[PDB]
Each structure stands twice: as C-alpha cells, then as structure tokens.
Ligand binder design. Structure first.
Ligand SMILES: [Zn+2]
Ligand SMILES: [Zn+2]
Ligand SMILES: [Zn+2]
Ligand SMILES: [Zn+2]
Ligand SMILES: [Zn+2]
Ligand SMILES: [Zn+2]
Ligand SMILES: [Zn+2]
Ligand SMILES: [Zn+2]
Ligand SMILES: [Zn+2]
Lengths: 75, 76, 81, 151, 423, 423
C-alpha cells in the first residue's frame, strides 16, 4: 500500500497510506515529508483534479501509482 | 623574502619580493607565470583590496603569509 | 658506382577519390556496401565528380533520379574496376 | 490565552487614548477575540455616511494574522460585496508578531481614503474608476448615501 | 561437488603462473605453456573421475575464464589486455620462419592448443588488432613459416568467431596472392620493354585492410625512375581507376658498390640507396646538401645517417668519434670512407588552469573588440596563448560555451557565430 | 571526460560549511555573514568575490539584509530573559521559540526568517536559530529545509529522480551528459529524463508532453497552469488580484499572471496588460514505432529470463557453456539496438524532408529489419543440435547490428556539427 508523489523539484517520493485515508490526511503527510503548507497544494491524478470530499478508494487510486503536485497560488 | 599568493580554485604560487617592490611589479611577476594582465588581476590582503600603486612593504607584510589572489574578468 | 641490382617496393592500392564515405550507406568507400555486407562490388563515378558504390547508387536512381549530395540531374560518367 | 492577555491590554490602551477616526469599539467581554467597530472617513464620496467593521482574531494570536471582515456594504474598487479586503499588512507573507492592531487600523483607513485601481477584485469597476473618475465620485456617493450609517 | 571444484581449480591455476612472475611478462612462451598445463591436468581430472557431467565441465570453464582474464601477469603490467597480447605474440613467434624447420603435425597440434587458450579469453577484439598487425608485418617482409599454416590459423579463427571477425585477415591474405599472380604478368609484359638494369618486384596491397600510413615525403632518385614509371603505366592499363600511393619507408633492394677495391655487394633500404647513390659524383656533401637533394625529413635522415656511420662506410671528419651518440648540425661534413673492408661478402647493412586562461583571453579580446567573428577569435586567442599552450579547438569552443552560459557574452541575435560583449 | 560525484544529505550539508570556509578565507567575516551573502548569490564564489570587491560595502549589506515588558506577550521578565539580533530589537525567548517553531513547522520558510518586530527585515542566521529552539524534531526539520534549499538553488547539484534515491549528483558544469548515481539509474543531468543519445533535450520535452498514449495530466497542466518566469514551477491560479507573488521557498518574485512579466512597471501608472490529413498519419507511423519499441524495452526482464531458460535447457542436452555465452552477448546487443532506435524515431519526426534525410530514413529502416531478424533467430532457431551454423548466423548478425547503430549515431552528431538538418 504505497503511492508516488512527483514533487515540484523532481525528487519523486513515496507515501505510505491506506485505501481508507482522505485527501486532507494525504496532504498532511506530504507537508510533513517536504514542507509545503497543506493548503496551496493541488494533487492531480489521471488527468482529473483531486478535491477534498471523497477518498483515494473513491477516486480509484491503485497501488504503486503516481499523482502530481502543483502550486495553488491565489490572491 | 618569500611570500605566496593563492588563486581561487586552490593553485599555489611562490614569489620572492624585495621591500621596495611595488604592487604592479608583483602583478607582473604573477603574469610571468599566470598570463593575466594586471588590469584583471586583483590582490587581496586583510580583507582590503591591495591598492595598485602601493609597495609590498607598506602593508608591513612578512614572508610566508599568503596574499590571496582573485581574478576579475572586467578589470577596467 | 652503379650500385643497383634489385629493388622490391611496396605500394598501396586505393580508389581515385577525394573523400571516402559513399554518402548513402556511410560505409568506408573501400569496404563492402550495405547489401553485399549482409552475406564484385565496384565503384561508379558521377558526371559531377562524385562517387558511390554501384549498388547503393543503383537503388537511389531506381527511386529518385537525383545525385544525393547536390540536388541535380545524374548521369553515369565512369565505372570502376 | 496569551491572545486574551494581549488583547485586553491593547483594547484598554486604545480606549484610554481615544482616536479621531475610530468610534464604537464594541466587543463581547466573554469571547473577547471578536471586535465590531465603526470607522468614519473624511475624503469624498465616502465621507458622507458611516459604516462598520468586524474583526475576528484567530486562536493562535499574535502568532497568526487577524483576518478582518468588512460587514457593511460600500462602493469601493478594492472591496468585495461579501466584505473581503486584501490589505498586505495582514497577509500571512508579511504578518509580524509585534504590530499593534491600531497600525492595522490606520493602514485600512489609508486604504479607504486612497483607492488602488491596480490591485482590484472588482475588475470592471476599477477600470471604469481609472477611466472617468469624475462621475464615480457621485455614483459611489449615492450608494453610500443610501447604504451608510449615522456618523 | 560443483561449487567446490570451481573454487579449487581457479585458486590452483592462479598461483601456477605467479611463480614465473616477471619472467613471463616478457616471455609469452612460458605463460601460455603454464596456462595450457593447468587446463590439461584438470581436464584430464574431470574427464574420467567425474564421468564428464555438465556441472563439472561448467566449473572448469568458468574458473579457466576467471584466472586467464585476471592474474599476476595482468596485475604486474596493470591491465587486462596483457593476456591477449601475450597470446598473439606467442602465435606470431610460433609462425615465424626461424632456423628450425616446424613439422606439419606438431605445428597443427600447437595451433590447435593456441585455439583453446584463445577461446577462453573474454576480449576478442584486442587479440584481432595485435594478430592483424603481426600478420601484416610477416607477410610484407616475406618472413613466414608456412602458407598452409597461415591459412589454417585464419580458417579456425573464422570457425570460432564468424565471417565478420576475420574479413580483414582474409583480404590481407588474398592480396599477397594477387600480388604474386600480377608480378608474373608484369614479367611477361616485360619481355618487350627491356628493364634498364635491375630485377624488379612489387607487392600491391589494399588500402582499408592493411594498417599502414601514407608516406614520408620522399624524392625518388633518377636511377629507379624508368622502372617506377613503367610499372605505374602498366598498372593503370589493366584497371579502370586506381591510384598507387607508393610507400618507400618499408622496401628493400641490393647494391653492388663497384667503386671500392674488392667488389662487395651491399643490401639495404631505399633510404640507404638514396643517400649512397647521392655520392656517385662527389664525396663532400653535408646534411643540408643531402636534404636539398633527397627531401627526406630531418629526424629520419639523422637516424639513417647514424646507422650508416655505425658501419665503416661513412665517417665524420673525426676518426674515433662515438657516432652512436654524437648528434650533428646542418653544417657538418660527411666523408665517404674509400678504404672500407669487410671480412666477407654480401653485407647486411640494416637494423583547469588552462581553461581559466582560455576564458581570460576570451574576455580580454572581447572587451578589446566587442564584435568579432568566431574563427578570427580562435586565431587571436591562439596568438595570445602561443607562449603558454595551444588548447584544442574543441576545448576553446567548450570554454566559449561555458562563458556564454556564465553570462559574460552572448552570440548576436540571428547569427550562429558572432559574439557580442555582455553589458 | 565528464567528472561528477555522488553524495548524501550529510555530505551535501557539510560541503556548505566547506564553501563557507573557502570564501571566508579571503573575506574575513564571521560565518553567519558569509552564509547569508553567499546564499543571496546562488552559491557562486566568484560572483560574490567580484560584487563584494567592486566598490562600496554598505550598499551590498543593505542589499543582503545583514548590517520593561515584552512587546509580544506583554509580561515582565528579568534582563536575562531578553535577546535579539544585531538590529537592536529585544524580545523574550518564549516568544522567540514559539515564533520560530510555528514558522518552520507550519509555513516551511526555512532560510528566509526575519526579525519579528514591525518594519524590520534583518534576517536570522543559523546560530541563533539553533540557540533558541529546544525541540529536536523541529531542529531536524530545519536542517532538511535548508539542505533542500541549498540543492535547489545551486546549479551544480541535482536530486536523483529515482522514487527513493537520496543522492545529489555534484558535477563541475552541466552539458546534458549522462551520469549514474549508484542507485542503479542513469539520467541526463540537464533535463532529468533517461539518457537520449541522438536527440536533443528540447525536442524530447516537446514529444514527451504529448506522448499521446501514456498520460493525460500534461493536457491538464497545459490547459490550466502557466509557469513562474523566475523559478519555473507549474502554478495554478484561483485568486483575482492578478498580482501573483511566487510563494516558493526562495523565489519571492511577484509578477503579472497574464503577460507573465515583471510587476514593477506593469500596472503601476498607465501600462495595462489587457493536423488535417498528412500530419496525423505521419504522427501515427512514428508513434506506432516508438510505442512498439517502448513495449519491447519494458519486457526486457522476460527476454533475459527466456533466453536464460533456453540457455540451461540447451546446455543439459550435451551442449557446453561457451555457446550459451555467445547467446547472452547477442541478447545484450539486441536490447541496446532497440534502445537507440527508440530515440532515433523521435529525432526523425521533427525533421523537414531534404536529401540528407532520405539517407537517414533509409538507413534506420535497414537497421530495424536486421534487429527484427536477429530477434527472430533467437526464439525459434536456438532449438537444438545445430550449433555450428546457428552460432555463426547469430554472431554475424549482431556484429552487423552493432556496427550499423554506431553509424547512425555518428551520422546524427556529424549533422549537428555541420548544420545540415532542417525542421
Ligand atoms: Zn555491393
Ligand atoms: Zn555505399
Ligand atoms: Zn553529385
Ligand atoms: Zn514575549
Ligand atoms: Zn529587527
Ligand atoms: Zn539515484
Ligand atoms: Zn536530456
Ligand atoms: Zn517562482
Ligand atoms: Zn500583464
């Protein structure tokens, strides 16, 4: 049960996560690993955006899969 | 008396000086082995840039001490 | 005085060309071409003083009728032996 | 809790000092982390008419910025009808944990007097304001006149 | 019982050649013989006792590969390409024509053994380079044991590595065959041309196959010119377009020196012929006067003059000079020694900071002339650094590119090669 | 050559104090000041040297930000409970600890941490940060953040793209030359992809964005995100000011979202920002070949396994070990040839048809066909007990394939040198 996150600086990293976990907790894990505050991140998988409502299993996140990270500058 | 000048990468230079030898003369003595005209060369000692017209003994240098050498590609 | 009775010399044979690539198969001009190599392979000369293997230039002229270094018309000028 | 200890002394200082631009410092003495206040401008057309502001101090104060909410409506190029202002003195990129809230007050009031048509969240309104300034001094005047408060 | 045998046989063979040490590193015979002995002994061991199961033969082969590729001889000369070189040298030293005549049976047997030691090595291209070089030498100099032996060795190499491996050697051999054929036709066509005074013979090679370079700037004497031109015109007749680039640096003949007192008969190279034929008229030429007429290069002329002066045919102005080491100047006489005498006849008279300097010059000339062309810049930087060193043109281009990406210059907009001063 | 190196986090952290010592040898300032100044110059020694020694200092120091109750908690404390930077402001260590902790644990700002008091901008060194906080995990987080900043800001270092390799490839100067970093991966140091021998980096990017059969997130990224002009990170906007400020680690550069230009003039006084039939067929052909080769290069484990299994099985039927050795070598060459043909197709896409392109697209078809025949030989025709011909066939085939691919690479590189292609 591991997935891959492609960071802004290349540096692909791997996450340990359970299929019942939510995107907010995923963001918290990414924040702990790298340092990006978990509120200007967007995670993109399979060409569709990842909101905060549903979960990885809902989004049909497989195992040993990659999902990208982009910034969410506002204001 | 024998002093040395260190380049930025780390290569070492041996030069003998006379008390009345001038900074420009030292630049030439550098160039006879480094091929760098004195406009590009700069000489560094005690954090202060070595003035062009001065004498090696003015700074009260004693031999052995390194007068660190730095390049400058503009050099006026 | 005369001091000459015998002589044995060594000479290298080579095609009478100025550059050596054949510019079609990119092989050395003296070697075999790209089809005779995957197994009587002479050189042909062009009226513009260009030379290639015979088999390479044959296929090239079979498809397009242009000398492939100078996009001009092509006609045979001297074979090789 | 340190938020409360700081805010009580800051509020006491503001009240004791007295100001010519801030009136009606209304605050719930129990929660004490929310402020309701009335500001009054001087420059037209916003001078005609009073209007109110609500401040929400977050839990982690003064180590996080106090978000400000602009309750009463107003016709300003740099203010949303929902009541959101940008005010770079507060954005999380520059909030320094020593600035007294009155400095925020003067910064906001200076924003009110002087518009910024180059950082707009009402794009068409700001473009028109930067185009034909003369009429909007009346256009916003009616809106404030019918939607301000008693000063 | 497999994994253990491999460890024993590899360990045993390694120290067998360690004993010879440096004595092998210059004598391939002992090295190849030792490897062969170890292999033969343990092949005989696993041939009968172990019934020749696949695993044991696999162990033998793996260990032989291991201890042939790296061992003491490899380490002492510090590379892995010292075993194939030694094998090639052994094969050459076996196929040369020595005083001893090789018996066909034992020759074939020994070549069969060399094939084994070859099939174990792991870099079969260095071996081809060295074998090609040595075969070229001993074919050109007519110094070979048996043409059947040469053909057999090439045939088994082809069997063990394929038609592409041994194409150069096959061409290199058929060339000597065609040369032998063509010389007879020249002799036949020669019945009607009356060759001036000499017995002529030539060996006409190919170009891509043999490892030889063009020539060494020689000016032919007038003695051989008739034969040279007649053969070149004959060759141009039988073929359409073909260009003989004669190379005299490796070619030999025979003199008769019918000027001394006892009718000797010399035997030397073409450079010797040029020099000695020069002295047909007079005997008071110097090094400069010689290079005026023979056009030979200074170093080769010095070598040839020294080798002649080692013999008593030519003598300096001094009589007891140690001609082996004394080097001479362009204004130095050479005297023909008229009284030379040899005890016999038929003599055989033969044998970075630099990058930083690049960048400094680049920026200096740039600020001197802001706008200027690439090739002219190359010339100017070469002039500025001539007293120091001549950096390679790729190195200068590289430093130019590094300085471009370091923001001290940028190629002008729209042109591939034109540099403007970064401001 | 291409001199490079591999390190880990601890060595890449210690090399920082190494560089600090190197520069401070001649600067003669305390370590904190040197670190600040150098970090402002993207860790380039000579730039700092020339900008420090070109004239005045105080302008640089202002350009680098270096030069009774508490005002934060409003409580009284002993004079032993007040500390502050060299700017003059004085606070207490409880507020210091909480401020630094919240900053570096909830904002990620590791290196650019400024003085708390209003209006000040004197940033905080390393020693003070270590001297105030007390937790250990916070300290290690700070170390990790500054190390990541050091790597990303520098242009001689690069994290390995492998999903878990923790290694930086320190090199002397970047030229898109492949390197390997001991985790088993080799990549193009300049673009981060796998090594691509003939094709240039930019065409590889343009082709890999729309690879058209592997990923779709690139379409989203193009359709909804620009890139920061300064730090080059993909940014998605959902605000309204149009006055974007890059909230990266140390790219605090503010600009305009639409024109993507600097914001200082822009919006200041008066400036206002406001495939038919042949193409898809050509793309279809090239992408078909590229995807086929990608599939085959993905299944390379199965090819090794299957040839190994047939290798053993053929060995047990009274066949020795050296045969199956040549078989392994053949497989290796086959894989290399497919790997090169892959990027050769990419190169041959973006290429306008001229004379020197039909030559290339006629050579690569031949190498394609020979690769296919070799792969056809292996599977079936290694069947059984026909070694003496199949071995010859396979050796002849793979030497030919290797020679041809070397010719293709040389053709491409010569064309680049001679400016002979047109797109
Ligand atoms: Zn042919
Ligand atoms: Zn050809
Ligand atoms: Zn032509
Ligand atoms: Zn405090
Ligand atoms: Zn301060
Ligand atoms: Zn790696
Ligand atoms: Zn690349
Ligand atoms: Zn940026
Ligand atoms: Zn714009």
């Amino acid at each position: 049960m591991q997935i891959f996150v492609k960071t802004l600086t290349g540096k692909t990293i791997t996450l340990e996560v359970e299929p019942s976990d939510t995107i907010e907790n995923v963001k918290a894990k990414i924040q702990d690993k790298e340092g990006i505050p978990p509120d200007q991140q967007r995670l993109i998988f399979a060409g569709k955006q990842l909101e905060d409502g549903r979960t990885l299993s809902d989004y049909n996140i497989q195992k040993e899969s990659t999902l990208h990270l982009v910034l969410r500058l506002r204001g | 008396m024998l002093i040395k000048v260190k380049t930025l990468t780390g290569k070492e230079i041996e030069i003998d000086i006379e008390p009345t030898d001038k900074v420009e003369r030292i630049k030439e003595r550098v160039e006879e082995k480094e091929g760098i005209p004195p406009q590009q060369q700069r000489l560094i000692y005690s954090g202060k840039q070595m003035n062009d017209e001065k004498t090696a003994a003015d700074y009260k240098i004693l031999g052995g001490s390194v007068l660190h050498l730095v390049l400058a590609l503009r050099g006026g | 005085r005369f001091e000459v009775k015998k002589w044995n010399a060594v000479a290298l044979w080579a095609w009478d060309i100025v550059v050596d690539n054949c510019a079609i198969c990119r092989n050395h001009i003296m070697d075999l071409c790209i089809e005779c190599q995957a197994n009587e392979c002479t050189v042909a000369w062009g009226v513009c003083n260009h030379a290639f293997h015979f088999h390479c230039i044959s296929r090239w002229l079979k498809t397009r009728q242009v000398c492939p270094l100078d996009n001009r018309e092509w006609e045979f000028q001297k074979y090789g032996h | 809790m340190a938020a409360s200890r700081r805010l009580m002394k800051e509020l006491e200082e503001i009240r004791k000092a007295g100001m010519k631009n801030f009136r009606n410092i209304q605050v719930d003495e129990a929660n004490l982390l929310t402020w309701q206040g009335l500001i009054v401008p001087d420059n037209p057309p916003y001078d005609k008419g009073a209007f109110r502001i609500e401040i929400n101090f977050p839990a982690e104060y003064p180590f996080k910025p106090p978000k400000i909410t602009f309750k009463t409506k107003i016709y300003h190029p740099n203010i949303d009808e929902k009541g959101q202002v940008c005010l770079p003195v507060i954005s999380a990129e520059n909030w320094k944990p020593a600035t007294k809230t009155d400095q925020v007050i003067q910064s906001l009031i200076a924003l009110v007097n002087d518009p910024q048509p180059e950082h707009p969240l009402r794009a068409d309104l700001a473009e028109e304001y930067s185009k034909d300034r003369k009429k909007f001094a009346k256009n916003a005047e009616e809106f404030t006149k019918k939607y301000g408060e008693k000063r | 019982l497999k994994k253990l045998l491999e460890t024993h046989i590899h360990n045993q063979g390694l120290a067998a050649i360690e004993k010879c040490g440096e004595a092998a590193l210059n004598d391939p015979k002992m090295y190849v013989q030792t490897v062969l002995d170890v292999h033969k002994k343990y092949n005989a061991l696993v041939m009968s006792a172990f019934n020749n199961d696949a695993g044991f033969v696999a162990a033998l082969d793996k260990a032989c590969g291991r201890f042939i590729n790296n061992n003491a001889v490899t380490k002492m000369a510090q590379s892995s390409s010292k075993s194939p070189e030694l094998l090639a040298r052994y094969c050459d030293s076996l196929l040369k024509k020595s005083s001893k005549n090789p018996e066909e049976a034992e020759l074939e047997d020994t070549l069969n053994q060399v094939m084994v030691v070859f099939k174990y090595i792991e870099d079969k291209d260095v071996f081809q380079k060295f074998y090609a070089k040595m075969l070229a030498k001993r074919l050109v100099h007519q110094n070979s044991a048996s043409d059947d032996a040469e053909a057999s060795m090439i045939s088994k190499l082809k069997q063990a590595c394929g038609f592409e491996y041994t194409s150069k050697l096959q061409r290199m051999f058929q060339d000597i065959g065609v040369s032998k054929d063509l010389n007879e036709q020249f002799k036949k066509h020669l019945t009607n041309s009356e060759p001036l005074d000499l017995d002529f013979s030539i060996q006409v090679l190919s170009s891509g196959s043999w490892p030889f370079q063009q020539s060494c700037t020689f000016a032919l004497p007038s003695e051989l010119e008739r034969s040279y031109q007649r053969f070149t015109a004959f060759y141009a007749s039988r073929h359409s377009g073909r260009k003989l680039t004669w190379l005299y640096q490796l070619s030999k003949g025979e003199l008769v020196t019918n000027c001394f007192k006892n009718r000797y008969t010399l035997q030397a190279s073409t450079f010797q012929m040029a020099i000695l034929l020069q002295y047909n008229t007079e005997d008071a030429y110097t090094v400069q006067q010689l290079t005026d007429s023979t056009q030979i290069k200074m170093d080769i002329l010095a070598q040839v003059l020294q080798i002649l002066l080692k013999s008593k045919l030519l003598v300096l102005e001094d009589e007891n000079a140690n001609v082996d080491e004394v080097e001479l100047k362009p204004d130095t006489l050479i005297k023909l020694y008229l009284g030379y005498k040899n005890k016999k006849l038929r003599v055989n008279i033969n044998v970075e900071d630099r990058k930083l300097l690049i960048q400094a010059a680049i920026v200096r000339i740039m600020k001197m002339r802001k706008v200027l062309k690439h090739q002219q810049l190359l010339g100017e930087v070469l002039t500025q650094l001539s007293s120091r060193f001549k950096p390679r043109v790729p190195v200068i281009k590289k430093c130019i590119d590094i300085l471009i990406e370091k923001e001290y210059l940028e190629r002008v907009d729209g042109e591939k090669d034109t540099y403007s001063y970064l401001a | 050559d291409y001199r490079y190196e591999v390190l880990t986090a601890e060595q890449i952290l210690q090399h920082m104090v190494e560089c600090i010592r190197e520069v401070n040898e001649v600067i003669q300032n305390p370590a904190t000041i040197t670190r600040i100044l150098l970090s402002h110059f993207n860790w380039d020694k000579e730039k700092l040297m020339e900008r420090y020694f070109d004239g005045n200092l105080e302008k640089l120091f202002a350009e680098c930000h270096v030069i009774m109750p508490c005002q934060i908690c409003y409580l009284n404390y002993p004079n032993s409970y007040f500390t502050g930077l060299e700017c003059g402001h004085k606070f207490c260590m409880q507020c210091w600890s909480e401020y630094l902790t919240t900053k570096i644990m909830e904002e990620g700002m590791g290196q650019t941490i400024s003085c708390p008091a209003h209006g000040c901008d004197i940033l905080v060194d390393d020693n003070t940060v270590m001297r105030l906080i007390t937790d250990s995990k916070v300290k290690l987080k700070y170390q990790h953040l500054i190390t990541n900043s050091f790597v990303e800001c520098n242009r001689l270092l690069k994290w390995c793209p492998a999903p878990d390799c923790h290694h930086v490839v320190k090199v002397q100067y970047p030229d898109a030359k492949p390197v390997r970093c001991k985790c088993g991966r080799q990549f193009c140091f300049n673009c981060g992809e796998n090594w691509h021998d003939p094709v240039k980096c930019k065409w590889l990017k343009k082709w890999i964005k729309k690879c058209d059969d592997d990923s779709e997130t690139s379409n989203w990224i193009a359709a909804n995100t620009k890139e920061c002009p300064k730090c080059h990170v993909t940014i998605e906007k959902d605000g309204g000011c149009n006055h974007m400020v890059c909230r990266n680690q140390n790219c605090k550069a503010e600009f305009c979202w639409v024109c993507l230009g600097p914001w200082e003039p822009h919006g200041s006084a008066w400036y206002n920002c406001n495939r038919s039939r042949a193409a898809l067929q050509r793309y279809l052909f090239y992408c078909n070949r590229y995807m086929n080769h990608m599939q085959s290069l993905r299944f390379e484990h199965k090819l090794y396994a299957q040839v190994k299994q047939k290798m053993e099985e053929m060995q047990q039927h009274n066949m020795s070990w050296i045969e199956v050795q040549f078989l392994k070598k053949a497989v290796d060459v086959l894989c290399q040839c497919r790997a090169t043909l892959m990027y050769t197709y990419v190169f041959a896409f973006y290429l306008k048809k001229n004379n020197q392109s039909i030559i290339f697209e006629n050579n690569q078809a031949d190498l394609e066909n020979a690769t296919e025949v070799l792969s056809g030989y292996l599977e079936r025709d290694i069947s059984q007990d026909s070694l003496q011909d199949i071995k010859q066939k396979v050796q002849d085939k793979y030497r030919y394939c290797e020679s041809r691919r070397r010719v293709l690479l040389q053709h491409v590189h010569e064309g680049y040198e001679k400016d002979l292609w047109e797109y």
